[PDB]
Amino acid sequence: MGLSDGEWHLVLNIWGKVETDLAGHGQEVLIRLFRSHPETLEKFDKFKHLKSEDDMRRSEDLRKHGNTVLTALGGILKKKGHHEAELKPLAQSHATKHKIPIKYLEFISEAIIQVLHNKHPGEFGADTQAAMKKALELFRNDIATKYKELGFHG
Numbered sequence: 001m002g003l004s005d006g007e008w009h010l011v012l013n014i015w016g017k018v019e020t021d022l023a024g025h026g027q028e029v030l031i032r033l034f035r036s037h038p039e040t041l042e043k044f045d046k047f048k049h050l051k052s053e054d055d056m057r058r059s060e061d062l063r064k065h066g067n068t069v070l071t072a073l074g075g076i077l078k079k080k081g082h083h084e085a086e087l088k089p090l091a092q093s094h095a096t097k098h099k100i101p102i103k104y105l106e107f108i109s110e111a112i113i114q115v116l117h118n119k120h121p122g123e124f125g126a127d128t129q130a131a132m133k134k135a136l137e138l139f140r141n142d143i144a145t146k147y148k149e150l151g152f153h154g
């Protein structure tokens with residue numbers, strides 16, 4: 001489950017590009033999530049009204065939340081294999097106030113991978129893709145562990 005130093009290095013190489021625009025990457029991640037899995041838009045009372053891609057792109061509220069999402073994920077990724085303190089409140093919030101099944105966390109992992117590949121073809125080769133995939137698997141798995149403790153079957 002754990003990543004090597006070299007795998008983390010690949011993850012943070014591509015994250016270095018994302019960092020220079022957390023809101024804009026985050027917006028594309030949410031859009032690709034919602035369009036690839038429309039059922040996930042149901043979890044977001046604030047965005048359910050957005051019925052088109054162009055509407056989603058014009059939503060400053062959607063853009064802002066994309067920054068929140070990727071800011072939180074960046075802090076986690078930057079902690080590499082010692083992210084217990086950053087991940088725990090996130091798990092807590094997504095197992096209580098917004099009950100997000102692990103399946104949808106897989107969907108957004110998939111959306112993140114697709115956005116990075118579309119926006120960063122050169123820096124996101126097969127090895128960096130495999131490493132980012134692994135980091136997001138570790139992330140979901142660790143969230144799932146906390147879910148169990150919190151009483152939520154994900």
Ligand code: HEM
Nearest residue numbers: 040043044046068069072073089090093098100104105108
């Ligand atoms: C990489 C995975 C994710 C990250 C890093 C993330 C991060 C966040 C953060 C930081 C917040 C606000 C603070 C908090 O609640 O702790 C939030 C809120 C929320 N999250 Fe997530 N999230 C992720 C995945 C998801 C998914 C897949 C869904 C639904 C399918 C979801 C649904 C929500 C909702 C509904 C809120 C509240 C929105 C609002 O403030 O109105 N999250 N998320």
